[PDB]
Amino acid sequence: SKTHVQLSLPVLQVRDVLVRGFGDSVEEVLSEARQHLKDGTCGLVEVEKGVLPQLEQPYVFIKRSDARHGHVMVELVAELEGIQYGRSGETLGVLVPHVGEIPVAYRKVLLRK
């Protein structure tokens, strides 16, 4: 019922990811990402060169939403064909479904719902 929720997200290496995106439209990927976040079945891939071309568009990014418990404040921004829906701060990673892959870290976030 809150505007923000504390979550700990598993950080996945891109080559381990089994389900490489959330859906087929900007609205769908945002909707599905929010549902997986709520259900604790959302992973995070940190963006490096070569990562994004190995995932499926539209992308869902988590981006830093301000500057000021390790739960960095973030919001969701989708991208399709180089157009972004939402404007925010720096990217912490790209969200993907988590289906039991072994992570390399956990990232604590305070997610704006």
Author numbering: 9 to 76, 80 to 124
Paper text:
Nonstructural protein 1 (Nsp1) of severe acute respiratory syndrome coronaviruses (SARS-CoVs) is an important pathogenic factor that inhibits host protein translation by means of its C terminus. Nonstructural protein 1 (Nsp1) of CoVs is regarded as a major virulence factor. On one hand, it binds to the host 40S ribosomal subunit and blocks protein translation. Recently, the cryo-electron microscopy (cryo-EM) structure of a complex containing the 40S ribosomal subunit and SARS-CoV-2 Nsp1 revealed that two C-terminal alpha helices, consisting of amino acid residues 154 to 160 and amino acid residues 166 to 179, bind to the mRNA entry tunnel in the ribosomal subunit.
